[PDB]
Amino acid sequence: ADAQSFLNRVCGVSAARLTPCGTGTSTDVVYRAFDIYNDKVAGFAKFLKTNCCRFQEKDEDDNLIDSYFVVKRHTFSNYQHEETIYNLLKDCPAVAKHDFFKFRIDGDMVPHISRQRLTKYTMADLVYALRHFDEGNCDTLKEILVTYNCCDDDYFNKKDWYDFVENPDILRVYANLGERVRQALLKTVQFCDAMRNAGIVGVLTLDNQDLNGNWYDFGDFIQTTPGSGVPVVDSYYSLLMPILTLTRALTAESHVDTDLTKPYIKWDLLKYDFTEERLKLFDRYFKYWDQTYHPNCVNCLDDRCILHCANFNVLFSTVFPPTSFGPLVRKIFVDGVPFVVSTGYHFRELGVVHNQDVNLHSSRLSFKELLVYAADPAMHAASGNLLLDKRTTCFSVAALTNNVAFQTVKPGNFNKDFYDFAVSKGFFKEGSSVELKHFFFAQDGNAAISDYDYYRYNLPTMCDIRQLLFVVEVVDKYFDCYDGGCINANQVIVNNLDKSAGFPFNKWGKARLYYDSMSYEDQDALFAYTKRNVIPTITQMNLKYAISAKNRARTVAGVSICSTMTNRQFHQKLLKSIAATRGATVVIGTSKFYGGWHNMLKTVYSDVENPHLMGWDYPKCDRAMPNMLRIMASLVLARKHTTCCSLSHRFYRLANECAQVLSEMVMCGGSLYVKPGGTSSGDATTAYANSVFNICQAVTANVNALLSTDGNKIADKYVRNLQHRLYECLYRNRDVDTDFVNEFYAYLRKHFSMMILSDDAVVCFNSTYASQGLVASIKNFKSVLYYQNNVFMSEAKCWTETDLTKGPHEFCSQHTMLVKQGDDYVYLPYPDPSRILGAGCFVDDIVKTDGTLMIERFVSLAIDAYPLTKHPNQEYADVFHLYLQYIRKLHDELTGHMLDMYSVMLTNDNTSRYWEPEFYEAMYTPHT
Amino acid sequence: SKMSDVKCTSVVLLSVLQQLRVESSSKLWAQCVQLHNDILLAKDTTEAFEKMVSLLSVLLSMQGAVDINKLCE
Amino acid sequence: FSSLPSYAAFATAQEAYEQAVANGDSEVVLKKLKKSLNVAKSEFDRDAAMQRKLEKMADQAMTQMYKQARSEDKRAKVTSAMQTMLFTMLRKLDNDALNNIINNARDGCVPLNIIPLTTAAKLMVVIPDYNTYKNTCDGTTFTYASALWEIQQVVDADSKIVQLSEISMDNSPNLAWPLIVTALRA
Amino acid sequence: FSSLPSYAAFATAQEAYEQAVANGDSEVVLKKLKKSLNVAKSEFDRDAAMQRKLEKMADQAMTQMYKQARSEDKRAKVTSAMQTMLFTMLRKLDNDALNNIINNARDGCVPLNIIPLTTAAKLMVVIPDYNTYKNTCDGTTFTYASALWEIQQVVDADSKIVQLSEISMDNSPNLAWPLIVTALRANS
RNA sequence: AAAAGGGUUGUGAUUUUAAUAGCUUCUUAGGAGAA
RNA sequence: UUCUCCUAAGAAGCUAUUAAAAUCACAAC
């Protein structure tokens, strides 16, 4: 039999019992992921291969195991070429065994190349399954997880088994892969060491390597003088990078012999600088990565190199003990007495940074030095007690008091008069469309520590370096139209000086006290001081007493006065210019009254073809945010400063922002904890940085959507060329191509138009391109969030709309409707009626319950009520009239009360206009 | 409008309990808070009424804190 | 702003000027009348503005004192208002279980613990007098919060354990009322 | 005010005009006297208006000076409070062990986080449930942070003292969790 | 009761001030008319 | 030389609007 003879030859001299998978001599059909760059296509995409025959090996018990034999049928010149290269490479242990033989297929002679003991799947399959997460790819991910003993098959019957938030145990499941990944890394370096010595020039791609780490596919390679060969590895490492942190390979480095069975390394407790160990790790794993790596970002040349080196540092820092990542302290003398003060920071991201203006001996302390020494946590933590808190997994530094504090939240007050009036009018009946949903929920003493423990979701994350470096330029294209720079202290504007100054300054007064005490010279001296030295600060957590639809507690972070002053002085000129602009993508500072909403909606609709609307939500947004994207947002904001600040000043400003906002010391209940990362509530820049992060996420989704598409099926030649140039710009080019950045920005603005405000976004997109795969959609956002943020975006929360006459389903908690006004049609926003009725019924202070004073309070609530009149639902319309009639009743009661008490009537009657409708109608007419 | 009345009465009852220094006992305060939030979230009336019965039993147990006979008259 | 001291002169000057123009009198007389009208009107407007200022100040004073007095009145009496409102709403609810527990508490039959929601959980109650026992209790069963319970243990003020049979009208003086009862939910 | 000399000159003109009107002098004399009187009135009004302007300017300057004095007083008070807090914290800390560890360091710098671990004399542990207590703090002495600690009396969530004999599996529902245990560092 | 109460934008009402604008007052010069 | 009329400048008083500060309240991420 011909098939049996072919199988017998395929078996060769090995003792491998082979199983004839496929059918006889026929080529097998498989669907697999490939990284590819040809003269006509360039992609990282799933393909149907149909190129080789495959057989399986069975154990001594004749059951099947994960070990395959693959034989390829191809041209004779390729046969000789691969034979020569393999004969060169034979000595390396990282190369799979190859055989070459000729066989009678057509009656004539055909050559075959065979390789042995391959796994079912390659590294590219694992990377694609994790990076492009969806249920179809889940079917492959399950097989990969089951085959290598990560988990048993029943595990996938759990609800939400994939969810990082609802099923944190999944993080334990992935870690088992990590060691198998690490062996893949070392093998790769070994392979390069052979390829250079043999004298070979070739590119490495993920698809060539199996899950045991062995390599094949020599056909692409060409020869060169021995000792001068080069590997090209950019795409391989860049694609692999997120998986490295997701699976946590370098955890194996933690142990003494690097054996997972040996005990942990016990470092010197006082050690704080690990530069040699970082260099050793980089040289071991990333030997042939051809770009200069700086362990300490202070040396870096520019913001892109800062991003590159911080991306490496975040991976490397996980190995080192948690106690070393903190501010460094030193002893100094003042007037003969010893102080302990801070002198530097050790960042997981930015390495070891030292201050430049330290004094070992001093005679006196000025006001600025007193502020600096009181602000930083060195004294409080050194004097305080030792704390071991079992309520949180987060690291805890010290306890400042002998007693811990438990803080409750009280319920809201009931405005019975308005409720009785509404019930008399006829609201709140069973079966009504309007009902109470927003309340003042109470909290027990455990609220603050639980909401802090919510920070546990933040995990280390290593981003795709090249993709991120392209996306940051695309975002800078979005932001480039504003102006910014530094200003002197006299120019800055403060909204409210009766707000808290943070810890410990709140002990002595509000911010007004510190703004009064310091002359402009002191503030400018402090701001100039921050440009040369790092100032750590303490942040306080507060519980917010406010109406909500959900019963979970909400905390907000107050930042110390020094950080607030210097951050205001640094960022305010750019932030005010962002607020001033109209018609931009970032829509902060635009009002909804006087026709603003219609203008915004008309702006977002501009010039798209075949349009649809869609919007999404980031779960756990502020807690989950990776540190790298916050650094990127800070650098994007710093880019405007290039005219006025040298590189060193900007690096020290970034270090200050990292020490104060990103990973500072958080004071909760009288105890100090370390914040693992993420956004803080009081940055003085929080909303704009959130907008930058939002735009970056959308652009990354678009890039993934365009690159994943099979380039053979795209009909438009222009889009094929754009995809080819996109792959070239990302993985196979070094310096920034400004022309292609402008071209991609124009493509995005034409086909995919956004409207952004913090973590809320609306986008109008070309449905035909979205269906073909040339622009992003909800699926790509889900995958991008899953691998980058480490959160699963519940699709039920997202929304999409097909009819533009109905507008967005939700923006800033407003619903949109189309109405006639004159002979024109306009868009109007209206709120959820439950919110308005609850704001009427429940108040946060007792005095508010009395209506007569609160007449002015009700008028504002009537304004938001006005659009509800346009609604076709009668129950919604009744609310506004209810508010007007309550205003009328309140005025009557006030007149009666004053007539009774003082016996003299009032002499001003402006309030008469308030209960009549026309005034409220003025609020939304575009006339002025 | 029974259910809305029940929820408003839960708000008023928890405010009355809070003014009565119930917070000093953390265990009892936690139970009261759980009852209050559960009544606010509830969707069908009989569950709200039973939870209200427990929450009112909390107030009634405090002998001499409120003159029930004087208040109800 | 009316009937002010300068109003009469202004009104009479305007009337005289209007009569003069109606007659067609001498131009110089008309101009003299018009200038007298203008000076009278200037004085009238000046004192009117002063009266406006006085009115505004009085209005502001009255409004501020009303606000302060009523804020103090609302703030001082919060506790009694809260309790009265609570019991008013409780009566308005008109539920059998709430009324049962409230009326029992009014008679002194208060519970010692939170009334449990679930089967076979433990409740403890105080019984002031044999009459309330006769009303609430029947043999081995107890009726409370519109629910049926099963008696577990009866105790006395001196912690003596009392058997259910002992509680009778004739024997009642012997016991040191009030009694404590423990029950489970059926 | 009537004491102004320009008002006095205006008053002399006013008396002249009133006498002329009472006597019934001719219109031409009345016109010339009227223009003289109106010159006097213009002088009086101009001086009064400039007096108003000067007085309000003086009031504004005085208010600015008063505000500055209050600001200086506040600055002095804040400086005193800051100095007192800093020196109290200086006196509180244990100099001997901190000096020993800082002298041991390679560069004189040490991480902040290790200072409470090494030097602190008193420890606090917050425990949410009985299993955690049994694991972490069973007994009157326990080892943490590579050191041996002996126990001082415990307080509950109500900050009332709990005896160590009470903390047991059967009794656990009665207590008001979490529990706060405090401890001192053993000499060895 | 103590304690503590963040960043950013928009909106309404009240009081104060400044600058334009309109009007009244009456002082000064020039032109015209009449004697 | 004297009277009447107009134009122009200065100084006061009233009023309409626009724009800046302070206080209270409302809404959104």
Ligand SMILES: Nc1ccn([C@@H]2O[C@H](COP(=O)(O)OP(=O)(O)OP(=O)(O)O)[C@@H](O)[C@@H]2O)c(=O)n1
């Ligand atoms: N573990 C495993 C199992 C099966 N396979 C299969 O082997 C074949 C690999 O083909 P090749 O000759 O190595 O590469 P190529 O197609 O010439 O290269 P390309 O142009 O980069 O796509 C495919 O059919 C599957 O991917 C495998 O490589 N690794």
Ligand SMILES: Nc1ccn([C@@H]2O[C@H](COP(=O)(O)OP(=O)(O)OP(=O)(O)O)[C@@H](O)[C@@H]2O)c(=O)n1
């Ligand atoms: N005072 C407040 C209030 C809000 N916010 C902001 O509102 C957002 C609240 O996050 P969210 O997406 O509404 O909720 P979440 O925590 O992501 O919850 P999830 O969607 O269930 O995962 C954050 O960007 C800030 O907390 C601010 O700044 N100050």
Ligand SMILES: [Mg+2]
């Ligand atoms: Mg290949």
Ligand SMILES: [Mg+2]
């Ligand atoms: Mg969100």
Ligand SMILES: [Mg+2]
């Ligand atoms: Mg949304």
Ligand SMILES: [Zn+2]
């Ligand atoms: Zn660098």
Ligand SMILES: [Zn+2]
């Ligand atoms: Zn600058």
